[PDB]
UniProtKB/Swiss-Prot annotation, chains A, B:
GO biological process: tRNA N1-guanine methylation
Miscellaneous: Was identified as a high-confidence drug target.
Annotated protein name in UniProt: tRNA (guanine-N(1)-)-methyltransferase
Record text on subunit structure and interactions: Homodimer.
Alphabetical list of InterPro entries matching this protein: Alpha/beta_knot_MTases, tRNA_m1G_MeTrfase_C_sf, tRNA_m1G_MeTrfase_TrmD, tRNA_m1G_MTases_N, tRNA_MeTrfase_TRMD/TRM10
GO cellular component: cytosol
E.C. number(s) listed in UniProt: 2.1.1.228
Major subcellular location class: cytoplasm
Root EC class: transferase
Organism placement in taxonomy: Bacteria, Bacillati, Actinomycetota, Actinomycetes, Mycobacteriales
UniProt keyword terms in alphabetical order: Cytoplasm, Methyltransferase, S-adenosyl-L-methionine, Transferase, tRNA processing
Keyword flag S-adenosyl-L-methionine: yes
Keyword Phosphoprotein: no
Role noted for this protein: Specifically methylates guanosine-37 in various tRNAs.
């Protein structure tokens, strides 16, 4: 797989060079590229942002600088991923289907976001997905991109109940006797019950 | 605020030293500490994991090594955050209330997770929260911790419709005329409509 990440903060994607994402690149399975958006600016200040039309707080990421960036990087086979709090939610279903792609481009937005037309224009030649990682507000799209990339890369290099290891008794807390029984069907029966219960208390919607 | 992050991958928390999270530490508003869990191991191999009781795939993070780590770092006033796919969902409501804390500890889990007793024992002296960032599977809790910390740190240093900046016309795509009208009540009326519509198409549950 080929992954290109476009951002004003390349260093924010350095965890992708560590642990399993790093093992995926070193195995030669994934080719990761992280680009500074400012490499496509031609002004003396390397401005990527500007004042929003219709006013409002914050700044808006310039469409022509992004347009130039994505014009060189993308092709008609590219899946352009635009992380945004306005997108559809990222799930494991999304991670699983992204493993069937040869080229993923992550257009990481800063300030108030990216000029909407970048997405409309890109959709003329390639598929585009606007995706949120959850119901919370982040200052940028780089942390979201790390999350999405390691979840895809986890499958590439191929509610949960509680886990216990040695010792059997620790600080007055004993490992449930059932996990020391040797009855594999009984162990499975318990794990289902505890998971089902944990699911009702924390995520009844699931 | 004081933030301590315990992990087997300290480098995975380096984006917190960049952008706004970095501005929060440099402003002296937040004191960030990232610890290697292996600094609390006494064996020759610095083993943090071991085989699970009742069997099953993968390894389980040892409770005594974590117990020793959290014993030194935490106090009775500490809010211990255990990122896990078994936790309650992280939202903006959670980020907003975490801004009222003086000490947050992030116990980042690897392998199949942390021995459940670490959480049960810690809950004897301090408050504990098991939290998931979404309906997807990650190889570790460090990316989740970056997400949660920048969302809290964003508020500390204090669906959305589309955004547009200069030029008015780009690649045959014009900025909606309404944003060039000068009628602030009309601009607000439109922004509500487009957001409400985007919300119905992507997040009707919201
Ligand atoms: N007081 C208001 C709060 C919301 N602001 C909008 C806004 C704009 C840009 C962002 C940046 N978001 C991301 O890059 C992002 C990218 S993926 C993602 N998933 C969940 N939440 C997220 O914030 C993100 C967040 C919020 C406007 C001012
Ligand atoms: N084939 C099975 C797939 C699930 N595995 C369980 C498992 C254990 C540990 C993790 C690690 N998760 C996190 O550290 C985590 C921490 S916060 C979070 N939020 C959403 N999703 C997440 O995975 C996380 C993920 C899945 C068992 C094998």
């Amino acid at each position: 797989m080929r992954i290109d990440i476009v951002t004003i903060f390349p260093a924010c994607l350095d965890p992708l060079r560590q642990s399993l994402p790093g093992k995926a690149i070193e195995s030669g399975l994934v080719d990761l590229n992280v680009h500074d958006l400012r490499r496509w600016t031609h002004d003396v200040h390397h401005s990527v942002d500007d004042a929003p039309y219709g006013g409002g707080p914050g700044m808006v990421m310039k469409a022509p600088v992004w347009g130039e960036a994505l014009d060189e990087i993308c092709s008609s086979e590219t899946l352009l991923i635009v992380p945004t709090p306005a997108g559809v939610l990222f799930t494991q279903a999304t991670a699983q289907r992204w493993t069937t792609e040869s080229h993923l481009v992550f257009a990481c937005g800063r300030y108030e976001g990216i000029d909407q037309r970048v997405v409309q224009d890109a959709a003329r030649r390639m598929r585009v997905e606007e995706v949120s990682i959850g119901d919370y507000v982040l200052p940028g799209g780089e942390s979201a991109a790390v999350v999405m990339v390691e979840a895809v890369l986890r499958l590439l290099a191929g509610l949960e109940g509680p886990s216990y290891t040695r010792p059997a008794s620790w600080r007055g807390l004993d490992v449930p006797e059932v996990l020391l029984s040797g009855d594999h069907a009984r162990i499975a029966a318990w794990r289902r019950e505890v998971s089902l219960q944990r699911t009702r208390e924390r995520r009844p919607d699931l």
